[PDB]
Amino acid sequence: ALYTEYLKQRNNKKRRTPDFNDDDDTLFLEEYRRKYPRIDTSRYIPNESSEVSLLGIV
Amino acid sequence: XXXXXXXXXXXXXXXXXXXXXXXXXXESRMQHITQGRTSMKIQFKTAMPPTEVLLESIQSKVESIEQLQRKLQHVQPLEQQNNE
Amino acid sequence: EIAQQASLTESIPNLLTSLQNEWDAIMLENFKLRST
Amino acid sequence: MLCAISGKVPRRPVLSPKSRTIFEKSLLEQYVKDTGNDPITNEPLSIEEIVEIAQQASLTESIPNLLTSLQNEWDAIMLENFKLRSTLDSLTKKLSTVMYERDAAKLVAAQLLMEKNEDSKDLPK
Amino acid sequence: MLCAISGKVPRRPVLSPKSRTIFEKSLLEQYVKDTGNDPITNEPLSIEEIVAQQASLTESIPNLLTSLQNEWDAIMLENFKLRSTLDSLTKKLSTVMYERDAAKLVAAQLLMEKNEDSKDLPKS
Amino acid sequence: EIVPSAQQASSIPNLLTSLQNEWDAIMLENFKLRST
Numbered sequence A: 001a002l003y004t005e006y007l008k009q010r011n012n013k014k015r016r017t018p019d020f021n022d023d024d025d026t027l028f029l030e031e032y033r034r035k036y037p038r039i040d041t042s043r044y045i046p047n048e049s050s051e052v053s054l055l056g057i058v
Numbered sequence B: 001x002x003x004x005x006x007x008x009x010x011x012x013x014x015x016x017x018x019x020x021x022x023x024x025x026x027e028s029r030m031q032h033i034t035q036g037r038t039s040m041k042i043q044f045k046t047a048m049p050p051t052e053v054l055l056e057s058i059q060s061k062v063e064s065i066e067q068l069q070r071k072l073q074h075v076q077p078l079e080q081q082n083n084e
Numbered sequence C: 001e002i003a004q005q006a007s008l009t010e011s012i013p014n015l016l017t018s019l020q021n022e023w024d025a026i027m028l029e030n031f032k033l034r035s036t
Numbered sequence D: 001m002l003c004a005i006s007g008k009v010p011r012r013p014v015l016s017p018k019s020r021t022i023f024e025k026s027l028l029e030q031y032v033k034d035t036g037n038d039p040i041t042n043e044p045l046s047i048e049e050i051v052e053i054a055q056q057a058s059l060t061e062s063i064p065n066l067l068t069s070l071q072n073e074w075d076a077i078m079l080e081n082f083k084l085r086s087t088l089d090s091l092t093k094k095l096s097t098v099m100y101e102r103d104a105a106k107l108v109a110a111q112l113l114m115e116k117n118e119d120s121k122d123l124p125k
Numbered sequence E: 001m002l003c004a005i006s007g008k009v010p011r012r013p014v015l016s017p018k019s020r021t022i023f024e025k026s027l028l029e030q031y032v033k034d035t036g037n038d039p040i041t042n043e044p045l046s047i048e049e050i051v052a053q054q055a056s057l058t059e060s061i062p063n064l065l066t067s068l069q070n071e072w073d074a075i076m077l078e079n080f081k082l083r084s085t086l087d088s089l090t091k092k093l094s095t096v097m098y099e100r101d102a103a104k105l106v107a108a109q110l111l112m113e114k115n116e117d118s119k120d121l122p123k124s
Numbered sequence F: 001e002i003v004p005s006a007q008q009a010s011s012i013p014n015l016l017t018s019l020q021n022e023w024d025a026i027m028l029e030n031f032k033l034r035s036t
Helices: A024-043 A045-050 A053-057 B002-025 B028-083 C017-035 D025-034 D064-122 E025-034 E062-123 F013-035
Strands: D013-016 D021-024 E013-015 E022-024
Touching: A024 A045, A024 B028, A024 D064, A045 A053, A045 B028, A053 B028, B002 D064, B002 E062, C017 E062, C017 F013, D013 D025, D021 D025, D025 E062, D064 E062, D064 F013, E013 E025, E022 E025, E062 F013
Parallel strands: none
Antiparallel strands: D013 D021, E013 E022
8 A cells, every 4th residue: 555655654753843942842852862862972983893894794 | 577578568558659650750750851862862873873884884785785675686587597 | 613893883763763774675675676 | 572681572582690681682782791790680691591581563654754763863862861960960969968967967966965065064963 | 804714815816615704815725725624613624615886995884774773773772761760769769759648637637636636635 | 399480470472472463464465465
């Protein structure tokens, strides 16, 4: 049905935008951005540690 | 024995009060957003430096790796016509 | 009983953009393969 | 039923012999590779020490929605991990405020004992 | 990528069907002609025993699913670091608040006794 | 002896397992479609 109609199901376009002084809803959305940014910055650390060695091996 | 149980019971009561003060929250919201703005700043600046440092080294290796992938797609397509 | 993939530098996208593309690419290929 | 590391139902559980605890094979291995120890008892344990030791399949219900479920569940776990860490920092923080008062109080008792000692001398005279 | 017998890059790789390992044909052939065996496991192997869907290279659906295991399995250990550390802090808090509750009864009595000694002595 | 639950607490992981199980069919289907 997805291929026939030529329409992909929409994903969560939420984390990217958000807004300060929101409510209890944006309090969650804010706290989401922190944990994923810390996971992001940890996910970039173990890549850079090896760096280009892991890439050129593949 | 009696002193050990009275401390274990009180510790469970304070643990329930700590889980109750956390469930209600999820003034205060402005501080968390600013804490993220520090993170967003600090982290994304690190990310952009880690990215651009990687990109400089790895966009070359991406092209190397990605132009090699295109060779499989032609090495396969010829393979079938020869088998056929 | 008898491999390294370098996870991209911009690796949110794994949940949203990458996973979306995978089920697009699976969907539109097999449909096109059924056409073939 | 539950592996005592993550909280999952283990799909290839392994038990440690230094401390009676059924862990999951993946998680216990990572810990041993970090430091050769048991996570609960901190006893010297190795990978060869482990002895490899219900499966009921989840039938969600009657696919585009399942995409948004997995999104929500990761979105929830991210906050359920976050909330549990700020609570740890503030329970340690409030604990540190008690330690200052504990040691500050036992200095205030020393002056109060002097005032009692001074009084006992005057009463005798 | 390597041959397990020599350690070179094999130019004609042939995989055995008793000890699963990629050997160089010219090397393994001589090993079989010496004695009918597989070099690694020493199980019997002969020369005949040695041996349409288009693929694409292993990159960052299956590789994406195994990635999300690494994410969660690592985050599960992150929870232990805070569950274990919480059980030490709460245990030290319990004994700390008990020593506070056991001591403050003695502060209350000394404030009574030192003032009572001042109340007693000054009157005399 | 005895149950093990300690510092654990009594979803998510099976969703990924379910995602694998459905993919397992996707591959099996693509094979038989390509053979023909």
